[PDB]
Amino acid sequence: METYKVTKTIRFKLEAQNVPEIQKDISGGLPVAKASFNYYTINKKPVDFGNEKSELESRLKISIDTIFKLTRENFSKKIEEAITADIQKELNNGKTLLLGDVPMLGIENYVSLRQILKNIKSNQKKAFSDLMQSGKNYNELKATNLYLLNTIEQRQFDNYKVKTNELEKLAVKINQATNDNQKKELISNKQRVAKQRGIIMRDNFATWKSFSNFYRTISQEHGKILALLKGIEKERTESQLLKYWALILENNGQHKLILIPREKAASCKQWIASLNPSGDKLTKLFWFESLTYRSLQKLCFGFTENGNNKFNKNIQNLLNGEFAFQGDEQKKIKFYQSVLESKYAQSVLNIPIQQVQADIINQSFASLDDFQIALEKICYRLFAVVEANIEAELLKNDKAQIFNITSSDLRKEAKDKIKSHTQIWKAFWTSENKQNNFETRLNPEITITYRQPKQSKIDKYGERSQKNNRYLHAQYTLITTISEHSNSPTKILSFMSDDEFKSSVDTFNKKFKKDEIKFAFGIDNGEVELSTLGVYFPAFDKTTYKEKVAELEKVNDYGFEVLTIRNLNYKETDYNGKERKIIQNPSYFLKKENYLRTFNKSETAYQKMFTEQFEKKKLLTLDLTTAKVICGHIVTNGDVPALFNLWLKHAQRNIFEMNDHIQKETAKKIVLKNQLDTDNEKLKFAEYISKEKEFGKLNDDEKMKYTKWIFEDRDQNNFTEVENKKFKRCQKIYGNYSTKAKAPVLFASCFIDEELQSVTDIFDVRHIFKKREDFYALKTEEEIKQLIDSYNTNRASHDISNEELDLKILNTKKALVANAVGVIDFLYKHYERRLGGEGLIIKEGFGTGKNIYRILERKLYQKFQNYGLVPPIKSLMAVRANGIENNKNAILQLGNVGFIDPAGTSQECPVCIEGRLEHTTTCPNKCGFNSERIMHSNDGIASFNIAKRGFNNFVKSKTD
RNA sequence: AAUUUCUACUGUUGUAGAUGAGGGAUCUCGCUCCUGGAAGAUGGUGA
RNA sequence: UCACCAUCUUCCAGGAGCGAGAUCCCUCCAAAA
After folding, report:
1. Quick check: A620 and A534 in contact, CB under 8 A?
2. How far apart are CA A8 and CA A425, in angstroms?
3. Where are the domains of chain A?
């Protein structure tokens, strides 16, 4: 399908060769210099600007008389007069009524409208509050000046006073007897009490409420204008760093940067243009020139109204501003064509006269866009010169400054696995690009950043350590931005209104035909670990159980190949006398080349190794948790350690905040256990894992049954379907704790000063830690327990702040999701190629309404956006809406992406549906299904079910 | 504890993923200090 | 029994200073001696 004007920021390492001027000025990257490839774009000198402040001031000097006309709210004349009377008080001394800003805006004589409004608001509430506390009556109220409130009904305040009274009563209960449990309880109640009171006040008070709205109104304009000012001022850098003309020099397969002083710029070009156009004399020079549709606009119009722009002065006859071109694309296009056609234009706009003439001037266009694209399409020009001795002449005369561009990839051309970003940069220079009319486009703007090496790793840690690493040094980082598929419509769905968006996206969705679909994936929502994955094909929809099972027996025909690690413990010794462990990075044992260079072994040994250490399988599901791609291979257990780190930190954070829960001076004994015995603990736990709203509807016996339904076998605790359904609805976080099944979990209960079997605080250690077999290879459970035990009491162990903890976690999350995105991308390609069609990525519709999952959602989307299978959009998380509730048939579609309802889960059998089932266990209905040689675990059945339903919903979905 | 990515693991030239860049307004909720009022426990005030 | 003082504490309201989070919009190529 089509492609998009995707924009990608990119960056490279800079090395100083000669910086006579830059070095004069020489935590994170710091801007130091900004430069452009376009000799015209430099000419926007800062001085080329007026005193914009004064004009904006015209928008701000509101008078008292207009204020009531600035609001949608309706006020009784008496209320309006009172506001005016109040304002008259405030009208004293200062006269310049303003929005409110830096005194530079309006001089100290200024008074903020917002503040005055906020003032009055505060005074009224305060006055009212103390009246309340004093215990006066309605008549008292009426005799007061509370214009905002004295209009309040006799009825209403009754409530409020009563309620107020309630707070007083409650307060003495808190003044006295100082019992925590009840005091907390009491505080809760009061909080509630206050909640509704606010509701009451907020909602039931028209004058108050109205005014509230009024204040909430005035602030919006102030906010809109303030954004403008900030933008303007920030952009309006009086001494803006943009002072250099950017050039490109190539030499010996390496590219160099050149920055020229502005003053010298002019003359430079002159000298430049006199040289030969082509050759193979080693040294080469480059520069950019182009004209843009967007610039035409700003050339043809703009300052025109100001009487400044001299271009339009000379073409007045050709014309009536841009706005005059109302509902007529043929007018603008022909207008423009004339402009171009205009020799005068041709005398100063550096354009391909011949080319423009042949295609632009000569031809007509169906729509404005078409014209636009062509313009910039052609306008983009790349110039080259061949001559030796160039750089010294530039240095000798032009006082130029030069930089070197470098990376890991650059410094070895002679290899295959180049990083994805470097392709772009490389591909840019190629002739084929030029042949295609500069498909890939370099924006004419660049950035230079400085980054002081971080102290923390310098002195005693890498410097004195004599390490190989180069973070401790000074660095110059180049920031650039590139385009893809520029020669394509700049389709934007962002700016649409309500009804508009839905139509547009639907039109988009029409691209995909129901018969084209060949396969559909599915992503489970399970929180036991990251997630689980499945795939489906329509052919599985047979008519009878026997047909379905037989079809399901063709995994050799439909499945995907996989490699599995045999022995994790496996390790070797290299040619340098150090142990390598396979588990830590399998690649060293996969890619033949690396193996040889490391271990000095022969081809046959490699072959024997390969065969012995691994296994091959074909499956219809997968464990996404640990999955990674290596050298075009899928491995379940590729990266154990990534998970491990995740959990560990997981543990660290939750435990640390538990102790740091202002647990001051109280012996909140935090005890770590592998299970829970008493009902008090169990009941105190199930609450954490259920919705309080639905929890309150359970009785004590139901609460007891719920705990048994959690911590006890459900095959013997004969709960009813309604009980199960109620429990499922109560369930908040999906999980498993069946007795001590193959995923044992810990617990971090917190006794209160002793083993008092009545009250406790228990975070589900599902937030803290879980145990898996695989980890053992890394560390022994005893070592694992000892380590974590450090957390609970060892305060000194917490030498690092949260600011680090959080970002470590956040980035750890990023890494997993990145591995995930790799596997999913790989798979998609495979099937596509294998079946010659497009598939559907169906995801459990977890959203804002209902953390990784959000992340997973996002990054997934972007990997697919470069493919153009999905619309362009503001931001996925600012899109989603209703239509995702109470329907097993519901579906939301965005391109090939789709969201559905979470009703129903693993239990539904693939074949007989109704029979509850577990992986490795035969169907209770004896339908004939088996999961022995088709899936990997229990979770696989779920991800199979979700796709099955998702595809059925998609076909059911009808635009008809 | 080799990095445009120091972002992941291993590790002085590997496997993956990386648009992102900058920036700002509004609104809520947590924690400290200040001013006034409410309201409460003592000891002196007159039976 | 009542006006004020002594003492310490709870609460609300209002103001300032500090911290976290949702939600939205913009930025990323143009001139004459």
Report:
1. yes
2. 11
3. 6-45+241-290+380-484, 57-152+205-234, 498-554+838-956
Residue A347 near residue A373 (C-beta atoms within 8 A): no
Does the C-beta of A7 come within 7 A of strand C?
A: yes
With contact defined as beta carbons under 8 Å apart, do A214 and A71 qualify? yes
Q: Which two tokens stand for residue A443?
A: 């924006």
**Residue numbers 273-302 of A with CB closer than 7 A to any atom of strand C:** 289-292, 294-295, 298-299
Residues in chain A: 960
Q: How many CB atoms lie within 10 A of CB A878?
A: 9
Using CB atoms within 10 A of its CB, is residue A932 exposed (0-12), middle (13-18) or buried (19+)?
Answer: exposed
In this complex, the answer to whether residue A896 has its CB under 7 A from any atom of chain C, a nucleic strand, is no
Within 7 A of a protein CB, which nucleotides of strand C? 9-15, 22-26, 28-33
Interrupted backbone of chain A, residues before each interruption (C–N > 2.5 Å) = 26, 319, 850
Closest CA to A729 of A700, A691, A673: A691
Give the separation between CA A152 and CA A207, rounded to whole angstroms: 8
What Å resolution does this PDB entry report? 4.0
**Is there a contact between A77 and A145 (Cβ–Cβ < 8 Å)?**
no
Cα–Cα distance for residue pair A230/A417, rounded to 1 Å:
45
A234, A243, A238: which is closest to A446 by C-alpha?
A: A243
Of A residues 347-406, those with CB within 7 angstroms of nucleic strand B are none
Distance in angstroms (rounded) separating the CA atoms of residues A515 and A397: 68
Two structure tokens written together for A58: 């015209």
Strand B within 7 A of A469 CB? yes
